[PDB]
Enzyme design. Sequence first.
Site, PDB file in Angstrom:
ATOM      1  N   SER A   1      -2.035   3.224  -3.320  1.00 15.13           N
ATOM      2  CA  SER A   1      -3.307   3.539  -2.677  1.00 15.13           C
ATOM      3  C   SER A   1      -3.500   5.042  -2.514  1.00 15.13           C
ATOM      4  O   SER A   1      -4.606   5.556  -2.714  1.00 15.13           O
ATOM      5  CB  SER A   1      -3.392   2.841  -1.321  1.00 15.13           C
ATOM      6  OG  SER A   1      -3.441   1.433  -1.467  1.00 15.13           O
TER       7      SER A   1
ATOM      8  N   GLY B   1       0.804  -1.209   0.000  1.00 17.02           N
ATOM      9  CA  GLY B   1       0.000   0.000   0.000  1.00 17.02           C
ATOM     10  C   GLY B   1       0.839   1.262   0.000  1.00 17.02           C
ATOM     11  O   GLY B   1       0.964   1.923   1.032  1.00 17.02           O
ATOM     12  N   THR B   2       1.422   1.607  -1.140  1.00 20.35           N
ATOM     13  CA  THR B   2       2.448   2.635  -1.223  1.00 20.35           C
ATOM     14  C   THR B   2       1.899   3.915  -1.852  1.00 20.35           C
ATOM     15  O   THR B   2       0.722   4.020  -2.202  1.00 20.35           O
ATOM     16  CB  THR B   2       3.644   2.117  -2.022  1.00 20.35           C
ATOM     17  OG1 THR B   2       3.253   1.922  -3.386  1.00 20.35           O
ATOM     18  CG2 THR B   2       4.118   0.792  -1.460  1.00 20.35           C
ATOM     19  N   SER B   3       2.783   4.903  -1.976  1.00 15.78           N
ATOM     20  CA  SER B   3       2.533   6.117  -2.748  1.00 15.78           C
ATOM     21  C   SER B   3       3.781   6.379  -3.578  1.00 15.78           C
ATOM     22  O   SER B   3       4.821   6.753  -3.030  1.00 15.78           O
ATOM     23  CB  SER B   3       2.213   7.307  -1.843  1.00 15.78           C
ATOM     24  OG  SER B   3       1.015   7.095  -1.122  1.00 15.78           O
TER      25      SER B   3
END
EC number: 3.4.25.1
Lengths: 191, 189, 210, 142, 143, 215, 223, 254, 205, 205, 52
Positions: free
Chosen positions: I138, I9-11
Amino acid sequence: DIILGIRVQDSVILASSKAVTRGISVLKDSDDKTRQLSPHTLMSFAGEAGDTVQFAEYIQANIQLYSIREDYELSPQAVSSFVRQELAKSIRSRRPYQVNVLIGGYDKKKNKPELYQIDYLGTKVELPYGAHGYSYTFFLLDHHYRPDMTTEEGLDLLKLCVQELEKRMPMDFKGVIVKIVDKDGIRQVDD
Amino acid sequence: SSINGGIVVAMTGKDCVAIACDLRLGKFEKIFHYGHVFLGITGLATDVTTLNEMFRYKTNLYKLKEERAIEPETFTQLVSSSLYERRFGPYFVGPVVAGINSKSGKPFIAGFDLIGCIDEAKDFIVSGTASDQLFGMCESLYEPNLEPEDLFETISQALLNAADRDLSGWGAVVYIIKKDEVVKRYLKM
Amino acid sequence: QFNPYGDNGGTILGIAGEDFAVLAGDTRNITDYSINSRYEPKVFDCGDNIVMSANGFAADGDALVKRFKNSVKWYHFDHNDKKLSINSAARNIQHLLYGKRFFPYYVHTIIAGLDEDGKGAVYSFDPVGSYEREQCRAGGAAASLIMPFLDNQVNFKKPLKYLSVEEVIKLVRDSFTSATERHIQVGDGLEILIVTKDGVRKEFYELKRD
Amino acid sequence: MNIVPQDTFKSQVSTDQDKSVLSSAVPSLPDTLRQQEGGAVPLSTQLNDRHPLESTLKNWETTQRQRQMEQYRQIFGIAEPMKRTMEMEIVNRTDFNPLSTNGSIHRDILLNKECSIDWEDVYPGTMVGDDVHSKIEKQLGI
Amino acid sequence: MNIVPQDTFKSQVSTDQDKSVLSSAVPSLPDTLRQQEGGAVPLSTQLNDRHPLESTLKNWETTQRQRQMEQYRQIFGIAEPMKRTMEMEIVNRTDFNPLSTNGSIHRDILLNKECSIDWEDVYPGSTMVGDDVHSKIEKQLGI
Amino acid sequence: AGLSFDNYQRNNFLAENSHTQPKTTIVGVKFNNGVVIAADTRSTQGPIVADKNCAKLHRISPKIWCAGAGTAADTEAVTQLIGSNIELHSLYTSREPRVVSALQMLKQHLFKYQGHIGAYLIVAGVDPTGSHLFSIHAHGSTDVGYYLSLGSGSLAAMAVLESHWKQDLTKEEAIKLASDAIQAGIWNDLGSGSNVDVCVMEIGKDAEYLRNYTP
Amino acid sequence: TQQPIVTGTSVISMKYDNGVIIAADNLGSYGSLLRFNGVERLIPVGDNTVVGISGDISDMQHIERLLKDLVTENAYDNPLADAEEALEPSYIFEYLATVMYQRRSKMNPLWNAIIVAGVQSNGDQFLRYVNLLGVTYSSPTLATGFGAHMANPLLRKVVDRESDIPKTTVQVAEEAIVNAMRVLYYRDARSSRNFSLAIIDKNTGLTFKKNLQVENMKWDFAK
Amino acid sequence: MQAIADSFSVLVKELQYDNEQNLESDFVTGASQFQRLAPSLTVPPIASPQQFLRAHTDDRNPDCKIKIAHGTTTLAFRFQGGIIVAVDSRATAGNWVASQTVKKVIEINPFLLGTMAGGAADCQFWETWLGSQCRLHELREKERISVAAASKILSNLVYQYKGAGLSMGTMICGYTRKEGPTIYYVDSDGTRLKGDIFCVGSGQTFAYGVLDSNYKWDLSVEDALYLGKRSILAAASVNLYHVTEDGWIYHGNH
Amino acid sequence: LKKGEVSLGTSIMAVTFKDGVILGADSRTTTGAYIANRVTDKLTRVHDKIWCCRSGSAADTQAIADIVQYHLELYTSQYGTPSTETAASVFKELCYENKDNLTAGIIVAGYDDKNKGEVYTIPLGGSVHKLPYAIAGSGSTFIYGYCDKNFRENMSKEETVDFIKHSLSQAIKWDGSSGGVIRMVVLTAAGVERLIFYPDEYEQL
Amino acid sequence: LKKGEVSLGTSIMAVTFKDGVILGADSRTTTGAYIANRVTDKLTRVHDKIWCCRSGSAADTQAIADIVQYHLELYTSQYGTPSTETAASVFKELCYENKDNLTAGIIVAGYDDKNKGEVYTIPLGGSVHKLPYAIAGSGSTFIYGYCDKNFRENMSKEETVDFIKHSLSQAIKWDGSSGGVIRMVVLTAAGVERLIFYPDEYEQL
Amino acid sequence: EDINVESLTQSVCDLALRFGEGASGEERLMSRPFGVALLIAGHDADDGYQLF
């Protein structure tokens, strides 16, 4: 539970078997599958335990109340119609339960025997024959039935059906109780 | 013909061990030996027979190659690896190993899970269907550093108390194992 | 779908003596791996020398004890402050439990006191009300560890009749210490209520894990 | 302030829950004969396998009426719902017509349904009972 | 360029798919006695109820080596995979040891597994029929 | 060859016909010149305490150690297999094993089995390149951390580690911090208890294994 | 409800020698989205009680309405509402626990976990917990959710038993609570940096601190 | 009208204590909950109470499981002057010690007996309730209740709850002047069978065969007791009951 | 995804600018609501000036990245420095051919003398798209508008750094799976530059 | 959410400014991927200067809005012009008391001479929140960052119009369930103003 | 257990009150008071032989 009904020229013959509920060793001498609705109308039932006996006794109570109220006996046709109405009303708001009913009467006003069969959904059929339970007997009945049979010939046909059925029952088929409804009322055959 | 399940109990004494299994009185015993190492298996009977045959095979080959009997620790490692080989199709068994090392003389007991995880105990091992009630009885009855007669009495009493609390033809087989002598006894209740 | 039940993991023990009764329990409240509290009593004095415990789902046990105490209050009001006997309390609890036949309490219940002859009495209840009088009853987790320990040192058939209260207290403490050693849900404390003709007395003993 | 009816399920059952039809021989048990329901209908069967919309339809109008009364209480005071309920109760209590089941004209005026029709209006709908005396006993509480 | 093995299921079946154990009396049917599988193992039973990981484990090394060959073909040319496959074929062909199942030293050197151990090595994995040297001779020679 | 799939259908059939198939706090902390791994010593078969003194610190190589959770048999088997591979590779290369090599072997082996080998590991070690700490998941993912926790008591231990961790720690400070985290796991988690085992790996020295450091 | 939608994470509370301390962060999360910042989850009920609620936010507002109604009904019509006829923490907790258990038995639970903290009229400390199932318990330290697994082991270091309560000053307890909040902000993905705290002391009364931020955060050990 | 005003005048709602049943069940207004001749049973307020109860009654603590009556053999027959009821008293041990021996037969009255053979709580509770009903009937009619009437009461009661979750199979045995000695069998499915010989248990075929081998209406009291004890021993110490017109008499191991 | 597997769940952001490319990410790894790693390095080096960030299954992306780095070493031994397009093609082939068993998405940022810095994105499924800038993860869903309003071609280095910092700060603010520090790599003709920004910096933007 | 029902996939914004409040929305109604209504007025009036926008089930929100308008007419007949807080409370009570059977979310904007313009939001579940500005709908997720970077207190009317136009244009650009024209209602002391903006205007922003 | 004679007498009197408000606040049950008087004679363990 096995019920058989045969209508002959002058009477109706009804045969029923015993219960043997579930792994309970019972020695008794009674018929728990038959209720006398009226002096000339008999009812045999086969189906789920508890519900069927409740329904049969409710019907018997209603018919006895009618007989006391009017000082008069309903015809077998009216009795069968009332039974069909009550059976269709019972499952109006609940899951249907397994039940099959044979109603055998002798119309005194018409002076003739009558036999009806009602299934679990409430389907009433007037028949010269009838059976419920173990599933051939229809073929034998069709082969050896006449509308003008006497009582003795009907009893012999019933004995033939019983002998045919016994060869497939698992040897626990005890004495089948046989009753006769005619102009003299209701009696039980010793044999 | 129904011989699945059962109970096996192993205990350590002063310089001895005790291993006992249930029996149906009256030829299917759940305790086997491969020299001076004893193995008791509970659970599925077909798997018990299969494991006994496989371990007899492997220990016979081991003795033919090494020209000496196998020690309890090496047998424990062998049982662990054999059980782990069937990682996705495991036998439905609980095995227990007991013995005395021929050289050091130290007693040894151990139990296994169905895929060969080793539980090396210093006091006792209980294997069986319940393993909760007889476990409590053994916990209440066990005392460390018992003499062989005391150990036999303790393990026999544990088996008898388990038998009484939940039959008719119940029996027991007990093994009292010392470095030089092994005694096999039957209990007829 | 919402699950209305839970499990809090306790251990209780009731023992009937010659002229006394004992009800003990561990004081640890847990949620399946975590310790909610290390001191949360589960054995309660209900009045008229009756001690009660309902082990299992804690909310159900609290509700049952609350209802029983209120019923006893009304019983005193309506019957000229008459003392409620142990058998009458057992029947009341049976009715309270069976009143939830189709949505049962998830508890095991034990009550203790003295009968009309002054002898110790213990009653055990199944979750829907089935009950019986027993000499000794262990309930909850680690009951299978506590009963054999007691049977190893007492002939329920020194005979239990001639045991004193202090000896029973010591035996209960020993069994709970062993169970605490062998079981991960037992520990942090033990509380014992003793019922005699002089009333109800409380004892507390620290267990492992503090 | 409910739109869809809520809390429609039973929380308790008993064999004497129907006070109208109770056996005189065993007062703790219901009278199967006078129920006139087919004779094989235990109460337990009524607790399961119902159509999900049935309870919503049966209690719809009562729920709307209660929401209206709650709004009146919030905006007007206690007196307005009190008076509406008093009027409706007087009208309902003074009406006793054992031979008919139709609602009165004044009840329709109070409900503001003088020129409204629903399926209850179109579809308004033995050996024992269904007589005038049973209705008299039920109405008078004797 | 696969990682997980793909296309492992059989697209068709037949009663003579196993050419090794074909019956002499009826050549289109298999010989159940010489199969020595237990006598009650129809081929259809092998098409259902398998472990989802068995096919992945069976074909893992072949899939990795095929990916390596594809990489060599992309980066070096056709000759490099050709030579690697030729070496492996020569090593595998000229080894016939019916009494042992252990892989050769040279195969492990070519596979870069000189100092590597897997459960296949630890667990290399009685009968009345077909447990003799002559069966292996016939299988190897295609007699 | 390899792990067998025989009796899979039979076991499923037995499970369908009502046959019951029969069936921890770990921390790693880096300090200024090495790494420490610590664990609890309680072994339970369900709610019953099977062993009060269980050794959970396992040796991949003399200066590379690990601890695990999940399926115990899988953890032990994978650790032993990777230890054998590491020893053979060290003999082949005539060099001290590297922690990254063990990490690669473990990662590829666990990825090959697609998560069906339930091994969750903390691996610490020292090699000629320095000190290293890693966490390894069953499905084949690995991560690098200055301090890591594992097991059912990992949240309490992580709270303690987050309270008292610094960039520059001495050997004694790191040992005390790891022991405190294990003690928190022991007190506040039902799965952890008994004693504490410690292993200290310092650059340039032999690995020091202290069993029952705090009882 | 039947499933929470907007939620709050954790409330942590501790007993010290003269009172209680409670704390909770200001965040209402919409799934994985940190939607609402500025949700007060500590409700002071009178001058001797604070209620911390975690879980569904709509149910929390319903509970706030119930508490306000309870306070208003206390003064109807006692002229001694501010006098000895004021509400006690035990009264409030008994009411809330009865409500929670009754709604659990109705298959329509309030998806919340509740901590009641305060001081009785005789100076005793009150600290109790009740959840959506109606399970109630007390302890010198209490926490909900992730705090129950992380903040509790820290606080039990300070107050490990009942005999440690008289030895614990307000400064030590507040420091422990603040450190536990920092740990929660470190390791909870649904947490917020902003939080509120409340101290209830039998001498100084109620002190309600808002807009408190986690400070002195170690991020420098990147490589 | 003032009651209407009170209904619309503004805590109690959330407690659900505006309902009289909730107040009665929690004993707020008095002990009327313990005054109901027909007990009130709580049902989950959901669409599928039966599925809920069935799912939650088959899921961990042995002490929180519903106790099931022993499936041990139970025998009853009627020879010439009463009823012989025979059970095996081999109790099953657990994590408890019994102060006295348990009984597998419920003593409904000094003249009535029943057997459990099912769920223990259901049998105990409803047979105590049946004893209350029989006592009230006898007080009203100034005469002992017939066995048919009592068995019919029990059957109607269990049928009203058919399919809800109850499980109980009982044998009502009695002796009255008008009827004689009578045995009925009542099941949780609503079955109600009159009979002469009943055998319900784990092994009951052996006992039934032993009875049928040497059963006669001219048996004496001692002979009937001996036959019942022998039948129980053949099935699988033995508690005996002899029911006569003056009540039942209990024999420990006769 | 597989049951019990670790998700990403990274950016992730990658922006092309006048002198090259910048690749940035947050540093949070989660296991639901619990943060299993406060400080993880999500910037993966595949070659000297070819970097990538990963999403989907962590194990699958790690295996794919290792194979791609092996492939690029093999390519380098033969022909020298590979183009960003070649690395993107290898990533795409691996992700597409195994998409029935592996869940993987990649953002590739590269610099080379011929093409002067490029950004490619490979979403789940295995398709490839060459973009002036890319965002993924995400948190990216919360900054689709902002980036679309604030990107210009041929920005300076400082402007690109500020743009990435602002966008990732908003993504961290709104997404619960995005965490503490912002890590960036600048790829130009000069070399490889690593930058890190702490919460006390970007949370006050 | 019952099967076969109609859902309110939309982009809703409400912004308080110096002189009052503004409520804006798009005009697209979709069943699956088919645009069932290309031109929809989503700005619902419950009182002369109290407006709302709806999300979730269309039927449930329509029924709730009808009941709220009826309630406010009764209140006006008794006490006069209600405050926005009263309308928000009635909306919240309706949404919360029926949340087990209806799926409704509301954004309420209002003006009165006492409170001088207010915005309330009631998301799914029935909780109420008062904010200086609010966004809701499926297309709002893409402008969480942008709005958070571009909102100022006490903006002029034109600045608020531009802010809402830009934000809703981005939401339209990125969300499939959003599109068509932009509708806005300005509630101040001077009255009620209606504004409409066409795709050929806002798509060039 | 057996009920106390005084408790039974109190219950009968509470029933006799039913022409007005009930003892527990019940609504009126009958239109007029009873026209009977009762002598209740009992024995219990608490109070011996009692006549009410």
